[PDB]
Structure formats: C-alpha cells, structure tokens
Amino acid sequence: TARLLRAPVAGTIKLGKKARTRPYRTRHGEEALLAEANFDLVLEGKGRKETFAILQGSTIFVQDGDKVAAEAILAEVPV
C-alpha cells in the first residue's frame, strides 16, 4: 500500500526549509520520522543532485545531513 524510496546513488541528505517532520514509531517498531507536510527531499550525489517529492504521511528513515549509500531506504510513501 506504500512505495519504498531508495537512494539511487551515495550522497548526503538535505531535508530543506519547507520540511516538517516529527518522531514516528513505524508499524514494525522502528524509530523514524513522519512527514507532516509535503516537501522535497534532496540527495546530494557526487555526479548529480537527486530530488524526491515526499507526501504528508510518509515515513522518513534518514535525517538531515546523513551520508547514505546507494540503495539505502530513504522513505516509505503512502499511495
């Protein structure tokens, strides 16, 4: 019922100014974040900047400034 968003490349996470998040314990008991507004998540790769539309109600598994590897889970987006 939800799509998983993964990092296409290694890079650093920028949540941005429009981002509104807050603590969230997922259905599997993991400590994460809940998007309480629509915002763009940014992944700064070496060769390109990737940007992802995040919907209100999405789970966010990363924090601003995190360094992530390619294929790391970034978010779970309800459909």
Residue numbers in the entry: 352 to 430
From the primary publication:
Second, cyanobacterial RNAP contains by far the largest sequence insertion 3 (SI3) “insertion” in its β′2 subunit (630 residues in Synechocystis sp. The 630 residues are inserted between the two helices of the Trigger Loop (TL), the key mobile element in the catalytic center of RNAP that is essential for the catalysis of phosphodiester-bond formation, NTP discrimination, pausing, and cleavage of backtracked RNA. The largest by far SI3 (~65 kDa) of cyanobacteria stretches across the “body” of RNAP and interacts with the initiation factor σ, thus sealing the main cleft of the enzyme. Notably, the SI3-head module forms a SI3-σ arch that seals the main cleft of RNAP and stabilizes the transcription initiation complex.
The cryo-EM map reveals a strong signal for the Syn6803 RNAP-SI3 domain, but local resolutions of most regions span from 4.5 to 7.0 Å except for the subregions making contacts with the rest of the RNAP holoenzyme. Since the low resolution of the RNAP-SI3 domain does not permit ab initio model building, we determined a 1.6 Å crystal structure of the SI3-tail domain (residues 352 to 433; corresponding to Syn6803 residues 343 to 424) of Synechococcus elongatus PCC 7942 (Syn7942) RNAP that shares 45% protein sequence identity with the SI3-tail domain of Syn6803 RNAP. The “RTRHG” loop (named after the five conserved resides of the loop) protrudes out from the main “body” of the SI3-tail and contacts the stem of the rim helix hairpin. The conserved residues R367, R369, H370, and G371 of the RTRHG loop make an H-bond network with four principal residues (R79, E89, K93, and N96) of the rim helix. The SI3-rim interface is conserved in all aligned cyanobacterial RNAP and chloroplast PEPs in various plants, but it is not conserved in E. coli and other bacterial species, suggesting a lineage-specific interaction.
